């Protein structure tokens, strides 16, 4: 019964992460149920916090009311408490927590999408996670769900090293995309975000120097296509 | 339970036997935990988990050989066992009793027969100034025992006769680390044993007093005892 | 709704439990295999378990069962010396546990206990001994003397035919000396097999040894080949 | 010819391994036993009766009162299988053995005695054999039914069963 | 042979087409195979006879109590599960007892019986309407037998399903469909206790083929005067080498 969730999981549309020296990366792709359909009314890439993003594989809904159900539980069980907000390994840990009672619970389904989460604390430096359906989590260097898991994992061993900057990760990350794809190609059908250098640009205000800014960044429809050309 | 028999139990109990591998050996002065990793891939990132030994308080640890999910929502709840005997007698929990602790609630699914035995079986490790050093058994029995020496997971049956062959009561604590690493020359289903696919752990009297320090091993470290004949 | 024979089956298989009333003064006895070569010694040794500082209670049956039990009597005998300031009668310590397990059977629809009970000692003041058993069902009965567990039938026989209610093992020594006889029957090595507790009148309860318990095996096995 | 250790040095391996405490310890000294008498397809009438020899001295110490069910479960293991993977006439004191009976007093004001140290384990072999050598004028002229303990009753009982049997 | 099998045996709580709950009609089957018990009524008391069936000398008889007090006026006595009617009788002897606290007089046994059903009457895993808490029928029948000043002496039986009679006379148990047509035969209008105590004894003789003593009976009586006294085991005796001459007489 886990089991049939994780198979609901394996087919749905890829996505990957990979963590680099002086960031992380996810994506997947934007499969529109339509032409008719605007693509940007939906995000894949989700903020959780400002120093964390998720991307999944699988079931849209699941996925959005779990990034909810995740916010939320950032602040209600860390950022209340501690002033800070909580740490990859943590948030994900009461992410998994979250997943890991819709299983041993009677009258529920547990969900049916794989996440990866992406993100840097202070203390623990950068680092990606993925959380499957079973409530397990695992600490990843690079990894991918979905259909094609398979061929971008193999790619992703065969092209990693631990020296890699942001910006070679990202170019990874766009080559593996490109094989798997199912629609088209483009800024409109990729979604791409970074936990990189602080962005003081995206804070809102100015006047206090010891907080700097999101490190969580979405690339935007035009920044893709221009990565895209130089490929 | 036809015979007189606990089978979802059994069922948990040998849904051990496939999972990990963990062993404890306590010496004269000192105790000792070890175990393997689950099937690794290239890219899964070695340092972090520390998986499958978790630490309990500065005196108190188990290692792990179960469902990982599983454990933690265990482990959890021991570690504050732990700090209630202590908001509430200013002394640190007796070993025995944070055990019993546990049984006990494994054991609560053994017979409230409407929820989920528990995968995972735990060796513990701790000291308390009443019992000397101890080491402790915990199955999702319910039932827990003492041990001068044990093991727990796939190839179990074949190690505690390694074990038994190796181990003499005088011994020191690093003659007991190397009756752990040693055997786990056997159970190992990985032909050749790496430092990335050990996790370790030490109770040892103090790098300096009549105290006691804690000590789960970084990589590095482990490497480096490593050294001493496994891999070199 | 059948669940309850079952579980009267692990009784069956359990580490063999027995009990032995005297002129004044009672006995239990009880356990399993020695040690697996490589098992802590000194850390489980609890065979009997102490109720209050009067009342004892062994058990065959699921090790990990009975905890529960030892506990949720070892409480009411406190909350009855609380709520009534006069230690818990054997018979009523006896009618509490069996009415747990009964519990556990009638009502919500949950599993019953993997154990049957003996539960010894002398009411507060009154000297006169009390033997009891429970069993999973949730009943509870008095015994001159009784066994319950593996092979627990063999030694209900031998009892049967060495025990007499008109003269009942008055010294203290000769009624331990009884009591293990009929566990060597079902052992499987001896002294190193089975230990036993001792309880007399007022709250005097000492525990028996390993050195005790063969100035007895060794003190038994030469009036023994002696034909 | 090949090994020169003569037999007397597995007649100190066999006693050596029976500490009447660990079983695994007992099973590998039983497991000796019935190595020797599957040793009978080898020569030395000399030899066969050093061992015919030690066996009657041995089930002596084992099986001639103090006996845990621990032993019990080993030796009753050997009867159901050795009788089975060898003629017992190859030997004049092993089965001349478990038939020397006596074991089954007759009534109670005393102890009686002891126990089904035997009958389940004379029984075991005959009902292996079940035909081979059951020559048991004595056993009929010799059984009980007065018995006092159930343990003997019903073991009596059992052993009549395979003696009709045969 | 042969196997004669409807479609509704097993059905728990629901109805047959016939208006049949087979959960309790079953229920009420396990009476007839339980210990025997019998309750006779005089104008002088009332008698309450059970077997008891020792089964060994260990076992110090009276560890089975199959007959037990209620208030010092009401006792009964039972047939089968006597672990599982340990919440029923706790249920009569507190309602007994508060009764007297809230209006200063005895209980009357009508009440004090119908009390003990309505307790039964709680059978159930859902209910709409009131709660019934609880689980399963209550697996014991009861044999209630007191003395209160409106209506005399009185018998009678309490079942599982929540309802009751009041006998003149009643068996229950192993032997009862033997028994009771032998009460049927032998009771009249104007016994004397002495009279009764002992053709509680003949009928405990008949239905269990064997010759009986203290071991294996228990006798209890009920007066307006004494109370509700369980006959220690001499007395229980001395009423029976009673009977062994009284039937000696042809």
Known sequence: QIDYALTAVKQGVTSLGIKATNGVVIATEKKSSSPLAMSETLSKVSLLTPDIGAVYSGMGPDYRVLVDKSRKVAHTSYKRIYGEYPPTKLLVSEVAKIMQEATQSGGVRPFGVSLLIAGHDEFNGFSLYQVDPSGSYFPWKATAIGKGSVAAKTFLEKRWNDELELEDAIHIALLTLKESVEGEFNGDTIELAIIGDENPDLLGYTGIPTDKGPRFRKLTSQEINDRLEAL | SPEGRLYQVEYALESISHAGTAIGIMASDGIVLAAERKVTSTLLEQDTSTEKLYKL???????????????????????????????????????????????????????????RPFGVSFIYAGYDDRYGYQLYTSNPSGNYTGWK???????????????????????????????????????????????????????????????????????????????????? | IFQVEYALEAVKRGTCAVGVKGKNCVVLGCERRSTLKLQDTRITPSKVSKIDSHVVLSFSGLNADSRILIEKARVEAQSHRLTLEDPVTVEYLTRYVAGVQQRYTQSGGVRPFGVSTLIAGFDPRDDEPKLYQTEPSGIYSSWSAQTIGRNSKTVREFLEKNYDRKEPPATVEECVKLTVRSLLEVVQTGAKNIEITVVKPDSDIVALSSEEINQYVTQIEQEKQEQ | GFCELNMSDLFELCESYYNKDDKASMIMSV???????????????????????????????????????????????????????????????????????????????????????????????????????????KLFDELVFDHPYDQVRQAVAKLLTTLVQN | ?????????????????????????????????????????????????????????????????????????????????????????????????????????????????????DLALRFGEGASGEERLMSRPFGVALLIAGHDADDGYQLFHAEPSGTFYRYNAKAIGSGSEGAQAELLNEWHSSLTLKEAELLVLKILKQVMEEKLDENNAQLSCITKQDGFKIYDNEKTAELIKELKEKEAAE
């Open chain 2, 57 to 115: 308080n500065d005196k108190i640890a188990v290692a792990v050989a179960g469902l990982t999910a599983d454990a933690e929502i265990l482990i959890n709840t021991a570690r504050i066992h732990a700090q209630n005997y202590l908001k509430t007698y200013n002394e640190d929990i007796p070993v025995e009793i944070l055990v019993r602790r546990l049984s006990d609630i494994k054991q609560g699914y053994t017979q409230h027969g409407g929820l």
């Open chain 2, 149 to 232: 020496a044990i093991s727990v997971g796939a190839n179990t049956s074949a190690a505690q006769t390694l074990l038994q062959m190796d181990y003499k009561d005088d011994m020191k604590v690093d003659d007991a680390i190397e009756l752990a690493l040693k055997t786990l020359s056997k159970t190992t289903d990985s032909s050749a044993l790496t430092y990335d696919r050990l996790e370790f752990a030490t109770i040892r009297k103090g790098a300096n007093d009549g105290e006691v320090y804690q000590k789960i091993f970084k990589p590095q470290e482990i490497k480096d005892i490593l050294v001493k004949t496994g891999i070199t």
């Open chain 4, 31 to 137: 497991e000796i036993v019935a190595g020797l008498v599957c040793g009978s397809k080898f020569m030395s009438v000399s030899d066969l009766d050093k061992r015919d020899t030690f066996i009657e001295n041995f089930l002596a110490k084992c099986l001639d009162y103090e006996l845990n069910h621990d032993a019990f479960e080993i030796w009753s293991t050997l009867a159901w299988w050795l009788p089975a993977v060898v003629d017992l006439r190859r030997s004049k004191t092993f089965f001349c053995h478990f038939i020397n009976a006596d074991g089954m007093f007759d009534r109670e004001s005393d102890a009686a005695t002891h126990q089904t140290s035997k009958i389940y384990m004379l029984r075991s072999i005959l009902m292996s054999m079940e035909f081979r050598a059951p020559d048991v004028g």
């Open chain 5, 1 to 117: 042979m042969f196997l004669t099998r409807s479609e509704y045996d097993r059905g728990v709580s629901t109805f047959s087409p016939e208006g049949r709950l087979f959960q309790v009609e079953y229920s009420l089957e396990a009476i007839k195979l339980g210990s025997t018990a019998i309750g006779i009524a005089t104008k002088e008391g009332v008698v309450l006879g059970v077997e008891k069936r020792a089964t060994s000398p260990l076992l110090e008889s009276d560890s089975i109590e199959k007959i037990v007090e209620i208030d010092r006026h009401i006792g009964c006595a039972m047939s089968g599960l006597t672990a599982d009617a340990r919440s029923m009788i706790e249920h009569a002897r507190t309602a007994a007892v508060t009764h007297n606290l809230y209006y200063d007089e005895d209980i009357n046994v009508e009440s004090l019986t119908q009390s003990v059903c």
